[PDB]
């Protein structure tokens, strides 16, 4: 045939792949962690958004740290040969490098290690997307007025907030980041490459949201998400 180009991931396998959504709202009392009002809005929005992208969505609620690790291990041991990609969304409390099960923390590196190129062979060479709505620390942004492949290749981490910073969640509307992510996927997934969709998410969160609080420490604060890409190709959710 004619000249060919190979700059984009193959997304025309029989299945787009799994979308695992872990939605942790209620935490064991002994942890002292607050309930995450608004997270069900996020989980429902994500389920619908990724359904319309033709992902096989699995929603899981209020998982312990042990259940999170066993779920991720089990999913990584499925046969993904007929799937184009893998998506995991984590909605919980967090700190830098950590997301919380209902009874204690899980290392993000432990979760993602299950999907390394050498440990999940049916996802080798395929994009592995981790979308994380969770705090990464306690800083607040005051704003300003205006052949082999690496085992860590083909991962993308879409973080809601900058490293070291809190992440913001509205109890009525859902989190700033997930609200914005679903809106941009709905509008642009048939149009734009995924990095460019996520850049529009960055702009939406950075420009349209600002916290309101009776507590001066927490009032009038801003947020910028962080795209962490080890992808090796362009990612389009559509194919020709």
């Amino acid at each position: 045939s004619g000249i060919s180009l190979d700059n984009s991931y193959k997304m025309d396998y029989p299945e787009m792949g799994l979308c695992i959504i872990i939605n942790n709202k209620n935490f064991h009392k002994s942890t002292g962690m607050t309930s995450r009002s608004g997270t069900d809005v996020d989980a429902a929005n994500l389920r619908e958004t990724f359904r319309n992208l033709k992902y096989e969505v699995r929603n899981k609620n209020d998982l312990t740290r042990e259940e999170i690790v066993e779920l991720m291990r089990d999913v990584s041991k499925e046969d993904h040969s007929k799937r184009s990609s893998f998506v995991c969304v984590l909605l919980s409390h967090g700190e830098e490098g950590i997301i919380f099960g209902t009874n204690g923390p899980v290392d993000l590196k432990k979760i993602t290690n299950f999907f390394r190129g050498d440990r999940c062979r049916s996802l080798t060479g395929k994009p592995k997307l981790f979308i994380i709505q969770a705090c990464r620390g306690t800083e607040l942004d005051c704003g300003i007025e205006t052949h082999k492949i690496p085992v860590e290749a083909d991962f993308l981490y879409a973080y809601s907030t900058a490293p070291g910073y809190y992440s913001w969640r509205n109890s009525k509307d859902g989190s700033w980041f997930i609200q914005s992510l679903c809106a941009m996927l709905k509008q642009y997934a048939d149009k734009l490459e995924f990095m460019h969709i996520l850049t529009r998410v960055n702009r939406k969160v950075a420009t349209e949201f600002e916290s309101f609080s009776f507590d001066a420490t927490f009032h009038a604060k801003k947020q910028i998400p962080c795209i962490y890409s080890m992808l090796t190709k362009e990612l389009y959710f559509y194919h020709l």
Partner: peptide
Amino acid sequence: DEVD
């Protein structure tokens, strides 16, 4: 607005 709440923090995670």
